[PDB]
Structure 1
Amino acid sequence: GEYAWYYEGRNGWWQYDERTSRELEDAFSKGKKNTEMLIAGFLYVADLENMVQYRRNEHGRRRKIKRDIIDIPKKGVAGLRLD
């Protein structure tokens, strides 16, 4: 039973990078309703009640997030395609 964090792409799921995934897991484990993440130098909000992420300070997409097993189909990790 091993788990990872994922964010929605247009037609699939991407796994979060290792550091961010650990931060999400910490926040989830403490019962936090939300947390902030640094993604490529930009601040994002992870809303753990509604299970969505979005950029903190400027416009962007709302992406679904989920916590699921490692052994699911996925597109890659943090924008780096699996080959």
Structure 2
Amino acid sequence: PSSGSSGFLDKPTLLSPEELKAASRGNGEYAWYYEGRNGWWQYDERTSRELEDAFSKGKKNTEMLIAGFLYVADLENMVQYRRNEHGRRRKIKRDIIDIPKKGVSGPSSG
């Protein structure tokens, strides 16, 4: 014989996406935003991890290499210009994001 219909999905509770955003806003995480068309655009995740690591570490200007693209981000002026193409450059701004980081804790040995 045969059988099958489709199945189900169902979903647990986690309160509204706003009730969380309340804290998740700042309690979430951060992200770097680079000037774009509309206004600013958020990086991938790693590319920023450097903008923060550098900035935090104390680095003023951090050089990044994108998909076959030598780029240089300067926190001093809060911008980013092409390694070779100094002309091509955009502004950058650190904004707060809501990433599920804190939630998924991951401590390490000291």
**For this structure pair, what is the TM-score category when the shorter chain's length is used for normalisation?**
0.7 to 0.9
Q: Paired residues, what number?
A: 83
Name the % identity.
94
Larger radius of gyration: 2
Q: 1:78 to 1:2 in 2, by over 3 A?
A: closer
Q: 1:77 to 1:10 in 2, by over 3 A?
A: farther
Structure whose residues are more often helix by fraction = 2
Higher relative contact order by CA 8 Å / sep ≥ 6: 1 or 2?
1
Gaps of 5+ in 2: 1-27
Task: Please give the per-residue CA displacement for 1:17-76, whole angstroms capped at 9, x wherever unaligned.
Answer: 211111111101111110101122111111101000010112543200011111699999
Gaps of 5+ in 1: none
Q: Is the 8 A contact 2:29 2:99 kept in 1?
A: no
Q: 1:27 to 1:81 in 2, by over 3 A?
A: closer
Q: Which moved more, 1:10-19 or 1:42-51?
A: 10-19
SS at match of 1:63: strand
Question: Aligned partners of 2:55 and 2:73: how far apart in 1?
Answer: 10
**How much is the aligned-residue C-alpha RMSD, in angstroms?**
8.9
Question: 1:10 deviation in Å?
Answer: 2.4
Question: Aligned partners of 2:109 and 2:98: how far apart in 1?
Answer: 14
